[PDB]
Design a protein around this ligand. Structure first.
Ligand SMILES: Nc1ncnc2c1ncn2[C@@H]1O[C@H](CSCC[C@H](N)C(=O)O)[C@@H](O)[C@H]1O
Ligand SMILES: Nc1ncnc2c1ncn2[C@@H]1O[C@H](CSCC[C@H](N)C(=O)O)[C@@H](O)[C@H]1O
Ligand SMILES: [Mg+2]
Ligand SMILES: [Mg+2]
Lengths: 223, 223
């Protein structure tokens, strides 16, 4: 609690100063909490980092795996130009209902879509539509399937596209080479895939904050 | 301490996988330790984040305030083209000598400079040369002077330039409005300048790892 109080106080200062939440973001959380969604959305300073990475990259087209109530989706969508496109995948139809409402409130209903079903079914469907490549992929769903989502990202991106993977530390569980936890297995497999793959270059960072001890990975698709 | 051991183990996993140090980086640290520089270089995974941000930017010109032994400078310099330029500022002449040898060993002598003296005296002399704008500014020197380094960054950049500020958590001290610590006061002033300036938009993230509890800020220059 001494640690967590300090991490809460520092994040409160950073968020209210640099990454303030407007009505669309606060109402998205309220509507998520009201609808029984687990409160596992990115922290606002993390949302702002996602938005800034999309902006720096010049992202026009964004793929997100794991919508929840569209809180991360509103952060990323706000990086996009008026003719941009964001596709988000969500397994739970009721999560998807909340997220669409939250995206419409933010004025992102024109450039965003939530596709319902297991992302490993939805990704091949999107691929069959032969879309223009995506500039940024945010992988934040069932971490067991992280290595499959990275493989799909490689098929749906181009040189200079970004891949962000949330929750890569798992309370410190990521170092256990003999884990029984499938979310650790998928996390380790995905990080090792980024390392080995000659078309990916990445880093990972341990974070603390209002969500506690965790971390994220950032990778670029190389030429 | 269990926390630090876990943070070390996670960082060793992430570093070996995603941000491995080649001999030029290992030798830069060995030479810095040898000459008795403080071991306060960025952690390898933070160095790799700098390099990735510079590559995402397509940076050609980088400004660094606080060289030490040139470890961060090598991560950043590796993103640059043959016609690129990294100008780094270092108070201590001995630090500067180490850093120049370390940058020469990495093959960066041709595109890098280390200018000796207090940065707030050296920066106006750079400005007198009518330099081309910089694409990324890394601020990592005396944190008391952060707000003045952010003001210099604004004068030496263009729209879409990136500013990174290291060590913005100050052991949690950053939230004390009445701080007697000049490093806290400079950190708070630079973060408020990022918030208030219409040409700046940023975030800050608390980190753990091999260097313990800290954090960084990232700001984008807006039109
Ligand atoms: N196989 C799968 N395909 C698609 N979504 C999945 C999935 N497994 C889990 N999910 C969804 O992944 C989400 C994880 S929480 C996502 C948080 C969100 N990105 C934010 O930061 O605001 C949940 O909504 C869960 O229903
Ligand atoms: N006023 C000032 N102007 C320039 N350099 C300064 C300064 N005050 C402190 N410094 C330098 O700032 C450095 C801080 S440590 C820099 C670490 C380096 N960026 C890395 O990650 O590898 C020291 O070398 C110190 O001498
Ligand atoms: Mg998450
Ligand atoms: Mg530093």
């Amino acid at each position: 609690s001494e640690s967590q109080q300090l991490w809460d106080d520092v994040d409160d200062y950073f968020t209210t100063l640099l990454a303030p939440e407007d009505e669309a973001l606060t109402a998205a959380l309220r509507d998520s909490d009201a609808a029984g969604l687990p409160h596992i959305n990115v922290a606002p300073n993390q949302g702002k980092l996602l938005q800034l990475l999309a902006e720096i990259q010049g992202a026009r087209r964004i793929l997100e795996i794991g919508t929840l109530g569209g809180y991360s989706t509103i952060w990323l969508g706000r990086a996009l130009p008026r003719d941009g496109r964001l596709i988000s995948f969500e397994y739970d139809a009721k999560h998807a209902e909340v997220a669409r409402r939250n995206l419409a409130r933010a004025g992102l209903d024109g450039i965003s879509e939530v596709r319902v079903g297991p992302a490993l079914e939805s990704l091949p469907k999107l691929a069959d539509e032969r879309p223009e490549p995506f500039d940024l992929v945010f992988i934040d769903a069932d971490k067991v399937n992280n290595p499959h989502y990275v493989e799909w990202a490689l098929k749906l991106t181009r040189p200079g596209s970004l891949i962000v993977v949330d929750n890569v530390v798992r309370g410190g569980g990521v170092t256990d080479a003999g884990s029984t936890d499938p979310s650790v297995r998928g996390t380790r497999s995905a990080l090792e895939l980024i390392a080995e793959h000659p078309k990916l270059s990445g880093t990972a960072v341990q974070t603390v904050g209002s969500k506690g001890y965790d971390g994220f990975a950032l990778a670029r698709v190389l030429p």
